[PDB]
């Protein structure tokens, strides 16, 4: 019984609760950054006209 | 280890309007580094 409802306890919080993977979004989300930014970067003058 | 956190603009200009502006027009290495800094002290609280 007990070990069913733990897996519907995570079955609830993994539905409703948000955040639960932040870590894996977090990676993504820094990885994706990197490109925004290094392309963000192909348009800099340097100096230049 | 210690948490710093690096003001780019001041420390590369130091109150200087011109380089202000040449280091904005320099691209955005301000951003990344600042918030790379950031991270890494949430981690420093994080590793505690």
Same mark, same amino acid.
């Given at each position: 019984?007990?070990?069913?409802? +733990? /897996?519907?306890? /995570?079955?609830?919080? %993994?539905?409703?609760?948000?955040? +639960? %993977? ?9 990885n994706?950054? +990197?490109?925004?930014? %290094?392309?963000?970067? %192909?348009?800099?003058?340097?100096? +230049? /006209? | 280890?210690? @948490? ?20 904005? $027009? ?9 918030? =790379?800094?950031?991270?890494? =002290?949430?981690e $420093?609280? @994080?590793?505690?």
């Amino acid at each position: 019984n007990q070990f069913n409802s +733990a /897996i519907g306890k /995570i079955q609830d919080s %993994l539905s409703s609760t948000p955040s +639960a %993977l932040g870590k894996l979004q977090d990676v993504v989300n820094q990885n994706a950054q +990197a490109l925004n930014t %290094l392309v963000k970067q %192909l348009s800099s003058n340097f100096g +230049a /006209i | 280890m210690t @948490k710093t956190s690096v003001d780019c603009t001041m420390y590369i200009c130091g109150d200087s309007t011109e380089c202000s502006n040449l280091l904005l $027009q320099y691209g955005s290495f301000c951003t990344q580094l600042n918030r =790379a800094l950031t991270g890494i =002290a949430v981690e $420093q609280d @994080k590793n505690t």
